[PDB]
Design a protein around this ligand. Sequence first.
Ligand SMILES: [Zn+2]
Length: 157
Amino acid sequence: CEMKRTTLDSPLGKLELSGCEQGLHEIIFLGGGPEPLMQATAWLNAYFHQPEAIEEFPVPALHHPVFQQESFTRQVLWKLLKVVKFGEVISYSHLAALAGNPAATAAVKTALSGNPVPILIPCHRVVQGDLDVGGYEGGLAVKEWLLAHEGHRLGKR
Ligand SMILES: [Zn+2]
């Protein structure tokens, strides 16, 4: 792909976004019109700074290779994106079922670890169970901060 990059300041530090004309590829934690990259930047900016309007912002097309071919991993990521909204959580186990393989909690955890576009695809909203927020590829404190930003019981600022 012919790649383009942009950065966005956020409460979680600088975010590097990468994408081509067919879609956003990655959102990386470094520590506005029609192209997918501009839609992604606008979406993430709204997520942090205008969260009440987040459903109004177009979700960018996604073009990381994990989205280019059918797989259970792609199903996990797509179903998570489609279904689990701002201020909600879902268990690894129920997400496994949603993605078409009810037994497959460990496989869901591995799929989520491969998510190239965190927050937009909300791996932070997938928890172990009602009273166990579980782990996070980006660090437990970040997961808990995002859930607090979204007003969830399991969040901690
Ligand atoms: Zn691409």
